[PDB]
Amino acid sequence: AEYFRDEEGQDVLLFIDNIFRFTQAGSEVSALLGRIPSAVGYQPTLATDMGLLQERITTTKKGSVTSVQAVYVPADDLTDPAPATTFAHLDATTVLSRGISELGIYPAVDPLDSKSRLLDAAVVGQEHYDVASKVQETLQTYKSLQDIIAILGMDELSEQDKLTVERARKIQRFLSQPFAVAEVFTGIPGKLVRLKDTVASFKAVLEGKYDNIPEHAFYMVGGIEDVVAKAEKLAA
Amino acid sequence: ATLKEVEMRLKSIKNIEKITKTMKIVASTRLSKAEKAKISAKKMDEAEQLFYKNAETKNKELIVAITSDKGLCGSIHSQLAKAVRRHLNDQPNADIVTIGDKIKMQLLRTHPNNIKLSINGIGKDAPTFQESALIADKLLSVMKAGTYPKISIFYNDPVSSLSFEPSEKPIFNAKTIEQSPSFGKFEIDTDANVPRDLFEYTLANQMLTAMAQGYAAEISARRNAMDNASKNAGDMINRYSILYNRTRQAVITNELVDIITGASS
Amino acid sequence: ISYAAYLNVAAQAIRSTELQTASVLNRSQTDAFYTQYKNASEPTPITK
Secondary structure, X not given: OHHHHHHHOOOEEEEEEOOHHHHHHHHHHHHHHOOOOOHHHOOOOHHHHHHHHHOOOOOOOOOOEEEEEEOOOHHHXXXXXXXXXXXXXXXXXXXXXXXXXXXXXXXXXXXXXXXXXXXXXXXXXXXXXXXXXXXXXXXHHHHHOHHHHHHOOHHHOXXXXXXXXXXXXXXXXXXOOOOOOOHHHHOOOOOOOOHHHHHHHHHHHHOOOOOOOOHHHHOOOOOHHHHHHHHHHHHO | OOHHHHHHHHHHHHHHHHHHHHHHHHHHHHHHHHHHHHHXXXXXXXXXXXXXXXXXXXXXXXXXXXXXXXXXXXXXXXXXXXXXXXHHHHOOOOXXXXXXXXXXXXXXXXXXXXXXXXXXXXXXXXXXXXXXXXXXXXXXXXXXXXXXXXXXXXXXXXXXXXXXXXXXXXXXXXHHXXXXXXXXXXXXXXXOOHHHHHHHHHHHHHHHHHHHHHHHHHHHHHHHHHHXXXXXXXXXXXXXXXXXXXXXXXXXXXXXXXXXXXXXX | OOHHHHHHHHHXXXXXXXXXXXXXXXXXXOOXXXXXXXXXXXXXXXXX
């Protein structure tokens, strides 16, 4: 990568999968090497080794290298020190959760556990940011009422809240986007939706414009237009 | 911690289970009194209906509805509220008298225009003639009931002892008595103002019956609902129990490892 | 004074005769508040 970054000076790409294996490998050798084991058993040089590696992946004035790093979280515990110190060196993360996988949403990205320093009302403008703000608030409310929902029915929630809950259930279903690489597995032809289109699609849903059609309509389908059509498909 | 936060949360769930259990039992007790009342009331109602049927009962309006102050009676409050909303599409601008808070709030959302009179302080008690009589008396004076050519009352008919279907029925105006051929099936002179008396009397008698049907449906629903709550809570006890057990084991392991690491050195 | 309000008052009076039961007393003692509402604002709750 460095040869491309530096010597060729042309923008590159980089994929790393898994950088947990990098940490893990170090922990195995560490014991044999003769180091007093650090917590969970990780190598004491965990911080330095990860640090050095992650600063050898960077965008210099010489070149810009987009990198994609894949972290096998062991037992899916983010509190584990190796995943934790990984979280520190990333510029954006989109943690994908087993729970959201169980919900059947592929992509299974947890929506309350994603961040980018590129999500800002300057970077993607106020309108995008406003759209995102409402999604976050709606989903967080939905997460908040999960206890109450389980203990007592949704009918025993406030009417105002019931609108929120219904909207959020729709948002959750809406978020699934069939993937063409996963076309085999899903059995649904993948669809890529424009950034301009995405903001529009969510904006409408947030204003409840197309909230009047089943959750199943939003389930495993692409953009807002596709949802409208899929309502017709279901309606038949 | 993990350990304590699991434990306190599990304790909460346990206490919740206990409360939902307690309510469900108490609900059964309370329900027995309610059902007894509903029989007696319905029998009384049948006598009034005997007149109206035999008479031929042929008919801004009034809408009256009943749902207690208190909630957590399942979806009694909101199934009736929804059934008001549909027939308040039907009515142009009818004045809704809401007997008890839970339906009042829901209807207030649907229109604040139509809400003119509402009650409060009914639900906690089992309906009694005293309540009905006073409610009727205020209904006549405040709402000027006769102005409405048709009145309709909404309540929850307790369809089966595990079901409730929100139900409505029409209270027959003094006009109805007048233009029904009830002269052909009964006899009054003219000295009595039998329309003005019978209207008033059946305004309350019909409402009391509706209240009794409703009260029984409320308590019955509350029993059904709190029972289903107990089941849901039990499942959560099991789910957090597994979490507790896992968490307990993990704590032992993690602490032990620290001890080993120290000892090894 | 509605006719049934007249009858109601009579019923309450009638348990005053010497022989009494709790359910009767409950039938002769209940409270509430009838609240007016506008086309909006609620004129102040007045005890039933």
